[PDB]
Write an enzyme that holds these catalytic residues in place. Sequence first.
Site, PDB file in Angstrom:
ATOM      1  N   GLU A 106      12.708 -16.372  20.571  1.00  0.00           N
ATOM      2  CA  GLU A 106      12.354 -15.214  19.763  1.00  0.00           C
ATOM      3  C   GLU A 106      11.522 -14.273  20.604  1.00  0.00           C
ATOM      4  O   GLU A 106      10.524 -14.693  21.184  1.00  0.00           O
ATOM      5  CB  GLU A 106      11.589 -15.692  18.538  1.00  0.00           C
ATOM      6  CG  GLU A 106      11.041 -14.619  17.654  1.00  0.00           C
ATOM      7  CD  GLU A 106      10.349 -15.182  16.428  1.00  0.00           C
ATOM      8  OE1 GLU A 106      10.181 -16.431  16.253  1.00  0.00           O
ATOM      9  OE2 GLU A 106       9.851 -14.316  15.661  1.00  0.00           O
ATOM     10  N   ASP A 165       9.292 -11.198  19.904  1.00  0.00           N
ATOM     11  CA  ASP A 165       8.685 -10.355  18.852  1.00  0.00           C
ATOM     12  C   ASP A 165       8.258  -9.023  19.450  1.00  0.00           C
ATOM     13  O   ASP A 165       7.163  -8.911  20.021  1.00  0.00           O
ATOM     14  CB  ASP A 165       7.543 -11.106  18.172  1.00  0.00           C
ATOM     15  CG  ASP A 165       8.028 -12.280  17.412  1.00  0.00           C
ATOM     16  OD1 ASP A 165       9.026 -12.136  16.679  1.00  0.00           O
ATOM     17  OD2 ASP A 165       7.406 -13.325  17.479  1.00  0.00           O
ATOM     18  N   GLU A 190       5.137  -6.820  15.508  1.00  0.00           N
ATOM     19  CA  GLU A 190       4.621  -7.485  14.279  1.00  0.00           C
ATOM     20  C   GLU A 190       3.380  -6.708  13.933  1.00  0.00           C
ATOM     21  O   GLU A 190       2.454  -6.692  14.726  1.00  0.00           O
ATOM     22  CB  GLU A 190       4.303  -8.943  14.533  1.00  0.00           C
ATOM     23  CG  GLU A 190       5.592  -9.770  14.716  1.00  0.00           C
ATOM     24  CD  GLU A 190       5.320 -11.211  14.729  1.00  0.00           C
ATOM     25  OE1 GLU A 190       4.922 -11.713  15.805  1.00  0.00           O
ATOM     26  OE2 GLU A 190       5.404 -11.852  13.642  1.00  0.00           O
ATOM     27  N   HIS A 209       8.376 -15.737  22.653  1.00  0.00           N
ATOM     28  CA  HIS A 209       8.339 -17.177  22.320  1.00  0.00           C
ATOM     29  C   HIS A 209       9.563 -17.891  22.920  1.00  0.00           C
ATOM     30  O   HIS A 209      10.653 -17.846  22.363  1.00  0.00           O
ATOM     31  CB  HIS A 209       8.413 -17.407  20.812  1.00  0.00           C
ATOM     32  CG  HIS A 209       7.314 -16.811  19.994  1.00  0.00           C
ATOM     33  ND1 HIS A 209       6.450 -17.627  19.286  1.00  0.00           N
ATOM     34  CD2 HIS A 209       7.045 -15.548  19.593  1.00  0.00           C
ATOM     35  CE1 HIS A 209       5.646 -16.884  18.552  1.00  0.00           C
ATOM     36  NE2 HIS A 209       5.989 -15.619  18.714  1.00  0.00           N
TER      37      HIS A 209
HETATM   38  O1  LIG Z   1       1.956 -19.166  12.507  1.00  0.00           O
HETATM   39  C1  LIG Z   1       1.379 -17.866  12.322  1.00  0.00           C
HETATM   40  C2  LIG Z   1       1.583 -17.050  13.619  1.00  0.00           C
HETATM   41  O2  LIG Z   1       0.886 -17.646  14.701  1.00  0.00           O
HETATM   42  C3  LIG Z   1       0.885 -16.783  15.823  1.00  0.00           C
HETATM   43  O3  LIG Z   1       0.220 -17.504  16.792  1.00  0.00           O
HETATM   44  C4  LIG Z   1      -1.209 -17.533  16.744  1.00  0.00           C
HETATM   45  C5  LIG Z   1      -1.855 -18.831  16.233  1.00  0.00           C
HETATM   46  O4  LIG Z   1      -1.352 -19.176  14.953  1.00  0.00           O
HETATM   47  C6  LIG Z   1      -3.336 -19.021  16.522  1.00  0.00           C
HETATM   48  F1  LIG Z   1      -3.717 -20.354  16.268  1.00  0.00           F
HETATM   49  C7  LIG Z   1      -3.601 -18.602  17.917  1.00  0.00           C
HETATM   50  O5  LIG Z   1      -4.990 -18.645  18.169  1.00  0.00           O
HETATM   51  O6  LIG Z   1      -3.186 -17.241  18.116  1.00  0.00           O
HETATM   52  C8  LIG Z   1      -1.754 -17.125  18.081  1.00  0.00           C
HETATM   53  C9  LIG Z   1      -1.439 -15.655  18.335  1.00  0.00           C
HETATM   54  O7  LIG Z   1      -1.945 -14.814  17.289  1.00  0.00           O
HETATM   55  C10 LIG Z   1       2.286 -16.502  16.302  1.00  0.00           C
HETATM   56  O8  LIG Z   1       2.267 -15.622  17.430  1.00  0.00           O
HETATM   57  C11 LIG Z   1       3.170 -15.954  15.195  1.00  0.00           C
HETATM   58  O9  LIG Z   1       4.482 -15.962  15.707  1.00  0.00           O
HETATM   59  C12 LIG Z   1       3.035 -16.844  13.966  1.00  0.00           C
HETATM   60  O10 LIG Z   1       3.742 -16.218  12.879  1.00  0.00           O
END
Ligand SMILES: OC[C@H]1O[C@@H](O[C@H]2[C@H](O)[C@@H](F)[C@H](O)O[C@@H]2CO)[C@H](O)[C@@H](O)[C@@H]1O
Length: 440
Positions: A212, A214, A217, A228
Amino acid sequence: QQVGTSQAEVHPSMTWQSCTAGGSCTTNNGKVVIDANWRWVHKVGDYTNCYTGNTWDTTICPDDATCASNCALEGANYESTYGVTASGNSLRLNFVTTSQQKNIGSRLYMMKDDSTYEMFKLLNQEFTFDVDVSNLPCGLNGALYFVAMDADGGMSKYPTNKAGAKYGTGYCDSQCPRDLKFINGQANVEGWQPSSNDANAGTGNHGSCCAEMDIWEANSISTAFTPHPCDTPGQVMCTGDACGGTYSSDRYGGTCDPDGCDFNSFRQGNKTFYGPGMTVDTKSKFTVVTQFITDDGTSSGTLKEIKRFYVQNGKVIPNSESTWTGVSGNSITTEYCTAQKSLFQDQNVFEKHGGLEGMGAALAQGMVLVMSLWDDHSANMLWLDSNYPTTASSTTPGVARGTCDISSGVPADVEANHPDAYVVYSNIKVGPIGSTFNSG
Ligand SMILES: OC[C@H]1O[C@@H](O[C@H]2[C@H](O)[C@@H](F)[C@H](O)O[C@@H]2CO)[C@H](O)[C@@H](O)[C@@H]1O
Ligand SMILES: *[C@@H]1O[C@H](CO)[C@@H](O)[C@H](O)[C@H]1NC(C)=O
Ligand SMILES: [Zn+2]
């Protein structure tokens, strides 16, 4: 799944442009399609739902295969049911739409024809679009992104999928989502358990993984761009908590990077760059350019850098610099990702799953363009626009990602307070690096 005939499926038209070096562009006659998870599913030859609320009819659906044989996806009324409208080169997604039922959100794919998704090949190209996020509050995410779906939504692989891309089948992403009702021509009734906070959702034994990118967002307060990678770039069905991803017992236990290597200007230490009245002013439309730079400057090179530019009021705005000690620059590179994850004390599974090279391997397969509008039933969008986790101190590098309050974004509140929130995507252009804007 089968094809229902009660409601014809007609895809709204949406044009986009292909550009050449020099800036000359040609218009493509695209059209968009809603994801199959939003559709009415009924018994073949009848009107009885196979799924209602967040539970399946286990007489019609006693197992994943019988369910796929017996259940038909229907055509969508884009505007009246889903709040989706398109005109020219523009697509508007509304958050809540009430018809006979209350619909929340949407997820749309760009098509080449009525049976086939458009397969974008982004290596050594840039993808550019205009967006209006001015009606998106804390807690909502207007997302524009790419996933390594199959072009026909799985039809040719899975004969039990008679619906295909025409009905928005085949979704996957780097969360290995298990909330999909149909994966690989099988239903997901086996193991299904309803969500504790979403009357329309649940999860089953099967998930759908793929890489993926992104692009976007965002809401009016914060934005992030995030590659990702996954061990396998394209669609793979996974089983159980071994899927990993959001909603599993261990987001890091599977084959895809659930976090990605992100760049959010606010999280990277500039609190005045993106937002209401800021350098990139979310009170009005702006252009977002995203460049996929390879090691040798060709489309068969290895992905090395992702760059970002904005254009607003005719001024070209380079991405903001990351300001943290030891995490510098204004783009995504391997050195940035390693340094950023270390400083922020985030587990680095980005490299484990292939890093930028792995992301590029997905880009090389061709990827489907997704436009969506969603709220966040896991983390209340706080990872995008607030402090996260909410226990941590905002002075710690990596914790503060925007100015939204830590008690914002709970889905029941978002759904009550912002039913008429919307996003507008428009004027998509893809071509060589520097070809879509006043470069460099
Ligand atoms: O699952 C929710 C989203 O997470 C996003 O990643 C985050 C983490 O969840 C945190 F724990 C971390 O500290 O920071 C990363 C980046 O913000 C993720 O990028 C997104 O795709 C998910 O929806
Ligand atoms: C935020 O970014 C803008 C645009 O690059 C810049 O003018 C401003 O100085 C930056 N702030 C910080 C703290 O670097
Ligand atoms: Zn009936």
